[PDB]
């Protein structure tokens, strides 16, 4: 009995009109915060039922929520799509009661229920950031000449491939390697979005700071096969990759 709905964003029309939704999607933390507030704590509704106070996340409750940023249902209208799921009841009249300019159509929600079998075909779209934890030589200053010390910095490098390998079967081999651990097996998958995803974060007289959030996103699509139905119920609403809370874990439950 999972909670699947649709938020609908314009991303089009007259360029002269300032569209706050367009800058709302052009950052991770904005959509993250707005969908995180979309499950408010119950005592706030009893206290302020009108969404008319300076909020605080300590008053809010915390759940491993997750979304999906897509676009382009055609038919002579370019439009952008937000697909959200989590485990608690969301509210959309509470969330966007002052943000009617954010959307291009009123949101809609129905009841959806997923079922899985053994050795059954599926169709899926996932998004996982290309993340490989590596020891790197540090490279700072860069004032005319390179300067390094013996310290090896620890971070997650974006995925790279050898010069005799195209990106396509490299990410196919990544998905093939990650399949038997998570609980499925595929025969082929198609790469259709490899790119860079940028964002920024504020944090606590104090100031505010801007740092470029960095994620090597990978959105794929097409034809899934399963090995056991019991290895998929714990995958939905939790995520399979990294940047889990940032909207990188929705299992597209479309059996066809």
């Amino acid at each position: 009995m999972i909670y699947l709905s649709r938020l609908l964003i314009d991303t089009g029309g007259n360029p002269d009109r300032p569209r706050p939704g367009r800058k709302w999607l052009d950052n991770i933390y904005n959509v993250h915060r707005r969908l995180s507030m979309a499950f408010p704590s119950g005592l706030r509704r009893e206290q302020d039922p009108h969404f008319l106070k300076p909020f605080s996340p300590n008053d809010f409750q915390k759940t491993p929520f997750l979304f999906r940023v897509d676009n382009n249902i055609d038919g002579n209208d370019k439009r952008a799509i937000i697909i959200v799921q989590s485990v608690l009841e969301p509210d959309w009249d509470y969330c966007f009661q002052n943000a009617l300019d954010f959307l291009a159509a009123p949101p809609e929600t129905k009841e959806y229920n997923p079922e899985f079998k053994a050795g059954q075909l599926l169709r899926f779209r996932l998004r996982v950031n290309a993340s490989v934890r590596r020891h790197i030589p540090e490279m700072v200053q860069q004032d005319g000449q390179t300067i390094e010390t013996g310290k090896i910095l620890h971070k997650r490098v974006s995925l790279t491939w050898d010069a005799s390998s195209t990106p396509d079967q490299a990410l196919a081999d990544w998905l093939a390697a990650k399949s038997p651990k998570l609980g499925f097996t595929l025969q082929r998958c198609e790469l259709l979005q490899l790119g860079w995803v940028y964002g920024s974060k504020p944090e606590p007289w104090r100031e505010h700071k801007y740092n470029p959030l960095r994620f090597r996103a990978a959105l794929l699509e097409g034809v899934l096969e399963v090995d056991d139905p019991k290895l998929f119920l714990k995958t939905l609403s939790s995520g399979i990759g990294k940047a889990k809370s940032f909207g990188f874990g929705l299992l597209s439950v479309l059996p066809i």
């Binding site: 007289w205 104090r206 505010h208």
Partner: protein, 97 residues
């Protein structure tokens, strides 16, 4: 001489009226000595005795000097129009954010 406010016309010439000093013994009063029935000897009913009264003139700026204003006259209620470039503004603005 105390100015009540900052830009008021002050008398350049300043009169002074004094009881007539007899000087030496004798010395009948000069021709400018006027009579004035203001020496009290009983006060219910008022009996007044005459006295000799003489006036000199003083000139301000050489023997009588002015004072400072020592206060404000107009009220002028408090100030609006907060600025947007001072350093005390940006710290509060960033703190509220």
């Amino acid at each position: 001489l105390q100015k009540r406010w900052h830009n008021e016309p002050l008398p350049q010439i300043l009169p002074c009226v004094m009881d007539w000093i007899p000087g030496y013994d004798g010395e009948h009063a000069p021709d400018d000595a006027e009579i004035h029935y203001d020496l009290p000897v009983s006060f219910q009913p008022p009996r007044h005795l005459p006295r000799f009264v003489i006036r000199r003139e003083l000139v301000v700026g050489e023997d009588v000097q002015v004072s400072r204003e020592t206060g404000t006259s107009v009220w002028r209620p408090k100030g609006t129009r907060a600025d947007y470039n001072n350093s005390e503004y940006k710290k509060v603005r960033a703190e509220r954010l």
